[PDB]
Structures are given as C-alpha cells and as structure tokens.
Design an enzyme around this catalytic site. Structure first.
Site, short mmCIF file in Angstrom:
data_model
loop_
_atom_site.label_atom_id
_atom_site.label_comp_id
_atom_site.label_asym_id
_atom_site.label_seq_id
_atom_site.Cartn_x
_atom_site.Cartn_y
_atom_site.Cartn_z
CD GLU A 91 -102.79 -41.29 34.41
OE1 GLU A 91 -103.27 -40.31 34.40
OE2 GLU A 91 -103.25 -42.07 35.45
CG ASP A 146 -114.37 -40.30 18.58
OD1 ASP A 146 -115.51 -41.09 18.49
OD2 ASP A 146 -113.37 -40.80 18.26
NE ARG A 150 -114.21 -44.99 18.62
CZ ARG A 150 -115.53 -45.04 18.43
NH1 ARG A 150 -116.28 -46.21 18.74
NH2 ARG A 150 -116.24 -43.92 18.19
CG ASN A 151 -111.72 -42.72 21.68
OD1 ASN A 151 -110.90 -43.54 21.22
ND2 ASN A 151 -112.82 -42.32 20.78
N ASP A 164 -106.97 -40.18 24.92
CA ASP A 164 -106.82 -39.26 23.74
C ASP A 164 -105.64 -39.91 22.89
#
Length: 286
Positions: A91, A146, A150-151, A164
């Site tokens: 996606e 994590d 940013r993720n 991811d």
C-alpha cells in the site's frame, strides 16, 4: 501463495527512500485489486549487496505480512518472488512518514503545504488510528519494539497507520529516546514498553516532531529516564493529549494502559468511518 503478482504488472516511477533491505520505489500496479485497473503502490526491493540469507529474510517478512488485514497497519498487496529482482508490493502512503509530515506543518517549514498545524480533532484521530493499529499488532502477538513517528505513515486521506536515533547495545541497536525505563535496564520489550513509545509519539505530534530530550546526550537520556524522568509537555499542548502521555509514562509498566484501552478512551470523538474500518470495532475484537 495467491499473493504472487507478475513482475510485468509493476511499473516503477521514482525513488521513495532506503528501507531496511534496499531502495523503496513509488510505482503503479496493474490489476492488483479487484475493481481497480491500477493501484498506487510502494515497491520494496533488496540491495544487490544482500547475502542470500538477507534475500530469503526479505521474502519471509513479506510472508508474515500476509497474515495482517488491518486498516491502520500498512498492508501488503503482493509479492514478486519468482526470478530476480524480488519485489514486495505495499500500500502506498502518499504523505510519507509521520515525522516528516509533522515537521512540514511547522510555521517556519520550507515545504509547508499551506494548512495550519494539526487540530485537536486531528490529533485525537491520529492517536486512535495509531493505537488501533498497535492493538491489532498486539492481538497478533507482535511487540513493535520501535514505535516512533518516523515509523508511522500518513495516507492520501491523512489516515495514520503503523508502517514497517539508535545506540549500539548487547542485543542490537536501541531507539533510546523512545524506550521505556525498564527496557533501558534489562533490554526486554513488551506491549507495555510499546505504550511508552506511543506516549513519545503523542509528544512528537504535539511538538511537531521536535527531537525528544534535545540537548541531552544518549547517555544522559538513558540515566534521566531510568531515574524516572520523562519529557516535558510541549507549549500549549491540549490537556487531553497531556493526560494520555501521563498514562503512557507511568514508571511501572503494569500501570500503563493497553492499546485497546486507548481507543476506548477516544472512541466517542472520532470520524464516523472509524467503527467501519477499526480493529477495535471489528468482529476480530468482539
């Protein structure tokens, strides 16, 4: 298995940036979703510097993602595993990672898109979506390990989803400024230490992604947080988000909320579509 897609259906447009295994490209995929002649996609590749082991691991991670169907987690759409190069088709998240997105709404920002910073309503929607995706991961028995702006990724319609800065350590690299105190201590990671990092993400959302603990070295952060320190509230932070942060930053991991609990607290003030798409409201949670 039925996730295989012909290499010839993927066309690549431009670089999106380095991922863990290789360059990620923005592309288009022909006839990959029933009812769509063409789908905007992110296409993951692996460096030619990869060992055979890393190539096999690249594909094994895609295999794990086949088990994930959640609106608030970036989903796998298909795999090119026959021949080389191999391609993992995701996606597309057209507004990129959440940290870059937040920094672009700062008043000073060179890339400001000419809209004001997030409203309270937008920040609560973000929090609910991130928490819903995390609740899903947790039900699937995955500790994120994590979580950080940013993720997190931002979709074309501004939906936020789980996608991811790091110090070397006895078990691998550590995102020190997002880590709970009990993780700085023994290096164990749990859904509870994920809830810590979620609080830091809310802090990044309300600070337009300032650096956590700016002016403190990694070594001082490790001691500040282990002693029981936590981030100060950003200027003019909405009370409601401040209360979430305080729940997340309980020193005892047992006193932190669960991700399902976060969505429960926020559920009454969400977009009308949220019960239609959320894991929280789904029969997989009922």
């Amino acid at each position: 298995d039925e996730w295989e897609v012909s290499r010839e259906k993927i066309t690549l447009l431009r670089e999106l940036g380095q991922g863990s295994f290789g360059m990620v490209y923005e592309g288009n995929a022909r006839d990959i979703i029933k009812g769509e002649a063409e789908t905007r996609v992110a296409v993951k590749t692996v460096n030619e510097s990869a060992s055979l082991r890393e190539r096999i691991e690249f594909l094994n991670e895609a295999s794990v993602m086949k088990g994930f169907t959640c609106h608030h987690v970036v989903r796998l759409l298909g795999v090119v595993s026959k021949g080389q190069p191999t391609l993992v088709v995701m996606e597309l998240m057209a507004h990129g990672d959440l940290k870059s997105y937040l920094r672009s709404l700062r008043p000073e920002a060179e890339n400001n898109p000419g809209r004001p910073p997030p409203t309270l309503q937008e920040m609560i929607q973000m929090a609910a979506e991130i928490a819903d995706g995390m609740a899903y991961l947790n039900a699937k028995k995955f500790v994120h390990r994590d979580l950080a702006a940013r993720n997190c990724m931002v979709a074309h319609d501004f939906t936020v989803k789980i996608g991811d800065y790091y110090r070397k350590g006895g078990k691998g690299l550590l995102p020190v400024r997002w880590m709970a105190p009990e993780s700085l201590k023994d290096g164990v990671f749990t859904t509870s230490s994920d809830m810590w990092s979620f609080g830091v993400v809310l802090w990044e959302i309300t600070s337009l992604a300032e650096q956590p603990y700016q002016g403190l070295s990694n070594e001082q952060v490790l001691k500040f947080v282990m002693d029981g320190g936590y981030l100060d509230q950003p200027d003019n932070c909405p009370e409601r988000v401040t209360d979430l942060m305080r729940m997340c930053w309980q020193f005892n991991p047992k006193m932190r909320p669960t991700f399902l609990e976060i969505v429960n607290l926020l559920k009454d003030d969400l977009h009308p579509s949220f019960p239609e798409v959320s894991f929280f409201h789904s029969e997989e949670n009922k």
